[PDB]
Amino acid sequence: SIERLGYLGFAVKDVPAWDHFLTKSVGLMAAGSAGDAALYRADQRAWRIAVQPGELDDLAYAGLEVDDAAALERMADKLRQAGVAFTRGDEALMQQRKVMGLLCLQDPFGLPLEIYYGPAEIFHEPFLPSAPVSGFVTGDQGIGAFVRCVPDTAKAMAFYTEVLGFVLSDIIDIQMGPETSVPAHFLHCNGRHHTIALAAFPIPKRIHHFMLQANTIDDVGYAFDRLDAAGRITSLLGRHTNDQTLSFYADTPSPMIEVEFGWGPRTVDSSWTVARHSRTAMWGHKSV
Amino acid sequence: SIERLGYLGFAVKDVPAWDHFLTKSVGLMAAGSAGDAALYRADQRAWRIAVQPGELDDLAYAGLEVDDAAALERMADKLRQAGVAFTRGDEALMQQRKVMGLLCLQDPFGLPLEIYYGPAEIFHEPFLPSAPVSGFVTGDQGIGAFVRCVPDTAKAMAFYTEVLGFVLSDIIDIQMGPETSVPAHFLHCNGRHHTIALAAFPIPKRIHHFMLQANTIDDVGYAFDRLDAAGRITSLLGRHTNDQTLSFYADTPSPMIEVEFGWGPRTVDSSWTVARHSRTAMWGHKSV
Amino acid sequence: SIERLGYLGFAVKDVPAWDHFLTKSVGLMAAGSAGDAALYRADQRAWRIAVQPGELDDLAYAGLEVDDAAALERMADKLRQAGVAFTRGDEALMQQRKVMGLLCLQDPFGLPLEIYYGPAEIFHEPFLPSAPVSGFVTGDQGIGAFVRCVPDTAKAMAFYTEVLGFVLSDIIDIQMGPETSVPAHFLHCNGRHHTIALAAFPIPKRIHHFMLQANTIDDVGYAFDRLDAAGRITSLLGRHTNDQTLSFYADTPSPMIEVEFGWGPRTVDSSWTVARHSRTAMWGHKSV
Amino acid sequence: SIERLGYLGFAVKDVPAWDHFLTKSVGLMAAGSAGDAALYRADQRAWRIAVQPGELDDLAYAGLEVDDAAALERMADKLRQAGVAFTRGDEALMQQRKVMGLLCLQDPFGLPLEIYYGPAEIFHEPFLPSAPVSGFVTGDQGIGAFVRCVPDTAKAMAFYTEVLGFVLSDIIDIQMGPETSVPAHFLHCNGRHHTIALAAFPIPKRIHHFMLQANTIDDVGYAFDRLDAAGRITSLLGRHTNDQTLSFYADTPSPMIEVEFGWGPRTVDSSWTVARHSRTAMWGHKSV
Amino acid sequence: SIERLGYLGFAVKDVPAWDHFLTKSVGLMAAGSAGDAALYRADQRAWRIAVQPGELDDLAYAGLEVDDAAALERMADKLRQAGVAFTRGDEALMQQRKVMGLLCLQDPFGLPLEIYYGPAEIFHEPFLPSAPVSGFVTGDQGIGAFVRCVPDTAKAMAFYTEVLGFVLSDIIDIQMGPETSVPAHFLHCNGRHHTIALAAFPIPKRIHHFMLQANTIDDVGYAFDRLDAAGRITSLLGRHTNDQTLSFYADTPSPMIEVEFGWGPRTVDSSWTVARHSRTAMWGHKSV
Amino acid sequence: SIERLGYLGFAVKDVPAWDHFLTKSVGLMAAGSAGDAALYRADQRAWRIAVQPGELDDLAYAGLEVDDAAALERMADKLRQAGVAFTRGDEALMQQRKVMGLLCLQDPFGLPLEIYYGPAEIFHEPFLPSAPVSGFVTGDQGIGAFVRCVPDTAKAMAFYTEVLGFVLSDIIDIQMGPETSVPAHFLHCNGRHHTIALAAFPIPKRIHHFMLQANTIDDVGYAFDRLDAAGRITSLLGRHTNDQTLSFYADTPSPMIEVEFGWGPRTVDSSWTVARHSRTAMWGHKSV
Ligand SMILES: Oc1cccc(-c2ccccc2)c1O
Ligand SMILES: Oc1cccc(-c2ccccc2)c1O
Ligand SMILES: Oc1cccc(-c2ccccc2)c1O
Ligand SMILES: Oc1cccc(-c2ccccc2)c1O
Ligand SMILES: Oc1cccc(-c2ccccc2)c1O
Ligand SMILES: Oc1cccc(-c2ccccc2)c1O
16 A cells, blocks of 8 residues: 655646745745756655646646555556556656656546655755755655545545555544535545545645645744745634644645645554544634 | 443433533533433543433443444444344434444343444534543543443353453452352453453342543542532542552442542553452442 | 732723633633632632722732742831832731732832732632633742833833842833834743733733733633634734743733733743843734 | 463472571562462462472472463363373362463473463452562563473473473573583573573472562562571572573572572563573672 | 853955855854844854954954843953953944943953843744754853964963853863974853863964854764865864864864864863863864 | 574685784674684674685675574575575584574575574673774674675575565665766665665675674774774765764775774664665765
8 A cells, every 4th residue: 555645746837936935935945856847855855846837736746655666566456456547657757756666547536646666865965944944744654745626535535545545534524614514534544644635625626735744833833924924824823623733724826725834743553543523623723 | 343432321310410410520521412312521522421311220322432434344244243133323323423333232131232433523622621620531442431230241241252352351259248249350442451341240220330530649539529528429449459440439310320430540451361359449449 | 039920900890701701711710709809710729810890990919929928028128128118918908818918019100019928729629720721830930920011111120120029031122113112121030931021011001911821732722712702812823032932812801901821931040141032923923 | 372480389398498488588478378288479469389298399380371261272272282181170279279270281291280361369468578578570471480300301392382382582501510511491481581491400300490580689689698597598699691680599498499589681572582602690600 | 250152253355255154064044234244143143153354364253141231240340350441332332233231352362352241032033054954052052162362371261260250171282293282271151161262372363263063963964065065174073082072173264264063062060170181082083 | 584694704815904903993802713713702692703814805604693493494495495505504514603503505696695593692701892892783683784796786686685585775876987876775684774785886895895883973983093093994984875874984904895884873664665865975975
């Protein structure tokens, strides 16, 4: 099964705005380019987020990591057994992503996924944030998470769990209207409470938002002010019911896609019990 | 197998007395109602104890928790293989218990059991005790425990261990008379030394008592005084031989059913060794 | 010198509103009454805040604590040497405040101060909050702090430091207007970064606000929502430059008097270095 | 497999001398009698060492513990498969040993072994040493260990490992003469470095000695003086090469059987590596 | 007495080279300007190092910090008693240095010293390094240290100890030639092993070098490479005999003035014993 | 599979030079001889490195350890299944190596390997270094590591992983020339990041170097100076990208074979993720 989320690639209409957003506001480290994609770092990996020009204004692909070559072949085997179409990346692609091997596929609703192993690290160019943030929590929990919009949760669920090996952490009934809610399913593939959540939201984007976890509460506090000066805040500070992440949300330059910048969540294991929650926030997160 | 005891439902003749008892004396948080049952909280769960009017004056049902949907199906499979009759709860029942799924059955002697998954949590309504108690120890150890009265221990043992997957912790020969004792069997399904004990007591109740574990010794000390002012004490403070729980006992408003309020026991694991004890108390617990 | 701030008494136009405010919103424990004052608890002390009817809608007095009888006499001596008028409380007053001895005086601008020793504690009636808050940080740091409005800071400074023995922690230039700021002086008399701050604010109240410190960040988060539902929020969450308290502000029912509810500040000692800051917030605290 | 050594029974010519030896010198707690055997305690177990009159002046039996009934049946199965004769203890024997079940057998050279489960504990009669010793290290590591004399190590090895499930920790070539040594094999069945060692010593006793482990170095130091006043010392203080136990040896009242009283050894696990040592002592243990 | 070294001001011929040096190589944060001085930050202080154009190519002044106003007056008193000339800084100077008060003087050999209190902090503009360094160790130990060149050590010693209140930590005989050494005197005024060292070196600069202490060994390792790429290394990594600082040295753009970038030294207290060392390095520090 | 690297044997032209090198410079303890091999100790093992005269000036053999006899037979079985030729060491060889059993084979390119169990320990002759080093990190991680030169990495990889059970940790592309690099494969068989690395280097030696890990950074610092006085340094201090070992390199007396003396690396487990690095050093290690 997938070990963790390692990278995200976006295709956007305003690359300079995304560049400023990811460096001056979020704190990521600019790390040159690959092909027509600008690269950004959060840690020792050569890159974690990629931004390229495109009319999509959306997540273009997501990289799903394994630990070694054999594990990648085993994932190939699973995709074959499941009837999911995939192609092995060629040399050019491998060089572009800076990986030792990869399989290209899509989830049931068109999101390109790239399962890989052997990512590049550059400890000789130590991470340097572009804005005041002490660092991010990644490591074995990967880069962070994202919330995937789907038309059919059950269908999405079967694919992510049965095929990719993710596991349901919990469910929240997200209130949409007076008498309307969406059952969001939070899935883990490691100690991070969730790496991918699935929800049938009525938005025209592949994802509702992506999430990065910073080292300290102050990291989060300072970032809020940075995004507020930029006029991008969508929620006040808050804390979630299910994962206990303390965060705020903000708009990216791509309409309808947000970012969540948080701290201090609960982690999980095999002993995690599926439960249901009626609210996303234990406190805070009022919309603005 | 069952992961933990999650809830208890009582059917009683004096609902107001039980309400006062569970809030002002024990410290539970009143949490509205469901159907004709009043609900009480000990933690983040939407409810842990339910009280409804009834001539029984006894435990009406007990909820046995699993971690996810698949585990529930696996329990279904075990019940089928064992020939134990059961029915899947309907929507109405699921809504009443605030669970995502359940199987209704009885143990060999008529106690209704409800095996479930996906309980409701409401972290947005943080627990607030009705009396001075810093909190209860629950989490993965569930709500607490109870001691089940049975006519045939061996028979009860086979069901709880072979069918529900509980495990014998130890046995105590409880002195009844000058030359009379009952071999009580203490069973675990997690780190709590026991969640259910089985004993052939000569009382006309399904259970001898239920037990809640508080965070501090002072929690226990203060509760004793609360129950003493209420005239409900049945034992002085004491400490058990087998689990090292430090507690006292008191009567509930249902005749012959007691509650045990304790602190600081030993926990268990796979390395737990079955042993036999000749007394329930290492010290204290004198009857009053 | 004064060891800590032990209690506050307010005189207000809407006692029921203050009662609801201090219990349902802040979380204090109602603790009966003394004279025409309603009493509220935050810990083991018999009372910490007192509310009585009055047209003032302001702080009526503040109790400044010492450790023993001799220390109280020594404070008497200091007041004599300094020419500050004072009167020893009579039996009736002592009984009302539940103290073993006290001296009544005023600061240079009319705020009644009561220096006392031997406060009453009632550990047999353990603290029980009226709203979800795990507890407050008091002990040797006293009940909390307040910010005192003064017409003459230098004059106020000389009295609090030279006479009462407080010590300057630091100064912040609080921006009032485009080119206008007030140099607020933060003073300590123990490990709490400040117990009293002095500032020449243009408001018609003795104090700008009082501050209570809760045990956890969640305590603060939950309280914000409680005060927001009440429509009382004046600032978003934030963190101070000087003390690192993480808090929010809200209106009390007395116009122009706020409360600050915070967590996790820096403490001080003899090695504290006076410094100057140009902003009150390191992050957050935007006015609303 | 066997989980730990739980008890030892000796048959001796001088019961009063053994009584004084185990209480006044070693520090064990006298715990009445069972049949014609006097019982001694080291902890919460009803008994750990038994002494009965007999011309043997030797170890009469050793009790090998399991964790539950099923494990005992599984050991029965193993003995059957291996062709080792055994008999299930009758009620009388079970009552005498205070166990819930047992199998009686002998090792290849005549030492009676008793495999059991469900030992009696009496926490209501807390352990009280007869001499100054803070306590013994037992628990999951059992009572201690012993060194078994055998004519054929290989043969003894096959039985203890293949049949009883013990595991080789290491081997020491114990120098007997100028050019003569005995390869002693140290075996574990839990965290205790060894519970049984096997050695082809030329003595006319089933065991060379038994070993108890005390809580502190001072416990050991004080015991030495106690045994020296009794004239029983056979070795000076020392520390072993293989287990790092710091101890001294002394004669019991049964000729050629010694006791080892030690402290602070290394524990083991699955990652333990078999090694060979040329001396028993890293330092000390000179014979006297 | 002086509490710590708070800031340094240099007057140099190549301001752009110093700017690049302090940001890209050392890792300091550029923090605008004051007068014709460019400012650099290492922590929460508004500034720690100042660089202005000048033919000196040397340390122009050093700021010596106290904790409050009274302490500053007490230092004034000491200077008066000692006959050392000084002037109180005017408003303009105070504004330039961002301090609440200061006294301007020189040491016996012309180095301008500025004793101050009430420095400015700007926690609302959190420190952001210009190069990969996790942070510096400052706080109560001040910015770091420097080694002061003097023609007369005894004379310099009397001034720094008797007048400014520094204390001798230890002495090292620094080998100059085959049979030539300089007795360097290392002085502390807080927990930092030394803040100022005095030595009769034959160089035409006020100081031999200044020293900054980074949080980690990696910080130091990475900086070495940064300075080596710049061609500025003067010593290999090493560790000092007296303070145990692990560091390397490099040239600044001002000829004959170096910088020392280190980690992990010993701290001191009242119990520090004066000792003498014959070498500066316990290991490493070979000149290059 | 192999548990760890236990010993190394070299065949050299200058035995006295190797003796001085391993004792006075590295710090190993001379431990007599076996056959025509001089023995050296790093810990409690009777020997860890052996040096014998020979024209090879290279690694003559390497000992690969298991935990017990059965494991050795299991390795025999694996070699048989794989078609790798091997011979069981005779008594003489066993006595020479001081082991209880061994299998002699070669890797695909001629390096003799000796898989063994039951090594000799001599705790009665506690380790005493010949030079100032507090000790080495060995234990379950074995003696250290080495980098093996191979003509065919893929071929070498298949043997070490599939046959001996080593596991790939990571890969580094070691820059050889302007546009030339060698993909070195770092393999583990325990917690040590690597025990054997494989690389297609163009040198006429079986190994590029062997590595020992000391207890402290000072151990490493002092050793550097020792080797520098001997004129043997090949690299400055540095820290690796993949294992985070902080070390320096030096020449042994055998041309083209170096030694690496390091400290403080990362350890591994099952959760280790294969990654790729473009440099060997995160910092330092400049060649000299
Ligand atoms: O981390 C998280 C935890 C719980 C809920 C959300 C969520 C909130 C709004 C929309 C979608 C998800 C989230 O990001
Ligand atoms: O927790 C417990 C541990 C040991 C015994 C009891 C017990 C005592 C009296 C009647 C039944 C059981 C108990 O609750
Ligand atoms: O705790 C505090 C720390 C720093 C500033 C304030 C403050 C803010 C606004 C008005 C007055 C004081 C405060 O309460
Ligand atoms: O614990 C131990 C560890 C190592 C050796 C012995 C030993 C010494 C002499 C005779 C037999 C065994 C022992 O008891
Ligand atoms: O921190 C330090 C500790 C000991 C010596 C020096 C030193 C070395 C060379 C010249 C002057 C001083 C130093 O900076
Ligand atoms: O421990 C290590 C970690 C990473 C690389 C090397 C290495 C460097 C040069 C040549 C071969 C290997 C090494 O020893």
